[PDB]
Design a protein around this ligand. Structure first.
Ligand SMILES: O=C(O)Cc1nn(Cc2nc3cc(C(F)(F)F)ccc3s2)c(=O)c2ccccc12
Ligand SMILES: [Zn+2]
Ligand SMILES: [Zn+2]
Lengths: 177, 176
């Protein structure tokens, strides 16, 4: 018999209460490789309103890490070890990995995971209003994967960041619609 | 060479007030076997299935998981949804019906060519207990906590080969 996926019963039967040893675990980051941190920084801060928590450089290994999150910049400790302990204990951060030199390599780009080979699909951002969010996006020149009133599910948008990664733009109080 | 701090910082804008209450809601991974995947993230990693949405028309299911007490999950089917998509730091797992039965099928983890997405990462109080327990349960490892230069940090794999990083935020500054 063909897969018609799991019933909710099979689904929840596979689910377990968290072992108590896991009770302070925290989903801390999603890492995406980025070609140009100038574009990506502009994009995430100026377009989507994230804040740059910390920039870490690895000279020996030739990359930097940029952690972005929705956090007030006045909360960031300014001292390096204190910044670090604070950043890595934030929930929901983006870690953008810049392998140095990819910005000036015109033969290099990353793969967004949405065409062969497929894997990762997107990150997603909850907004209060998708239609003003998207109208604002149009005004600033964001490439769209899906306009909110386009395609099948109206009220749901997918935009792209400067590397092509998909970003769902979503209204949590109108998803069940 | 890399960007200097000054170039990087000068590419950062303050958030437009328009973006007030935007929140980083979800990261989506395509998964081969939702039985394996749900068992892993709940039993092994301690996350909680918040909701399941099915779409028979396109032959796919979505599973949402977060570190959340199941006693906050509104029972009301309309209000459960609203709550779920309002939680921060969620995983949307996407099962395309069929794939669990096709031995030729696996997803790409983004860590070999063509590279992209790299990993998710989980903040833990103690990487060694965490991993000792992962090892005990048969979790497959990329980097064990003692392996390599960065000791105190691990990478494990989920049932799809997606790399999950394990770190202690209090130890990061020493490690690096
Ligand atoms: O990923 C990038 O784009 C850059 C990159 N490189 N490296 C160096 C590596 N150390 C490894 C160790 C193993 C090992 F198998 F030995 F564990 C396997 C693979 C690797 S890559 C990282 O450690 C890393 C961590 C976060 C973000 C980006 C990177
Ligand atoms: Zn990482
Ligand atoms: Zn999604």
């Amino acid at each position: 018999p063909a897969s018609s996926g799991l019933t909710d019963e099979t689904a929840f039967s596979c689910c377990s209460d968290p072992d108590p040893s896991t009770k302070d675990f925290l989903l801390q980051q999603t890492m995406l490789r980025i070609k140009d941190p100038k574009k990506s920084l502009d994009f995430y801060t100026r377009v989507l309103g994230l804040t740059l928590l910390q920039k870490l450089d690895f000279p020996a290994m030739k990359f930097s890490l940029y952690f972005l999150a929705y956090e007030d910049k006045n909360d960031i400790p300014k001292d390096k070890s204190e910044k670090t302990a604070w950043t890595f204990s934030r929930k929901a951060t983006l870690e953008l990995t810049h392998n140095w030199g990819t910005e000036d390599d015109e033969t290099q780009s990353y793969h967004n995971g949405n065409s062969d080979p497929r894997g990762f699909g997107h990150i997603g951002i909850a907004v209060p209003d998708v239609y003003s969010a998207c109208k604002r996006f149009e005004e600033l020149g964001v490439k769209f994967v899906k306009k909110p009133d386009d395609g099948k599910m109206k009220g749901l948008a997918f935009i792209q960041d400067p590397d092509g990664y998909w970003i769902e733009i979503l209204n949590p109080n109108k998803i069940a619609t």
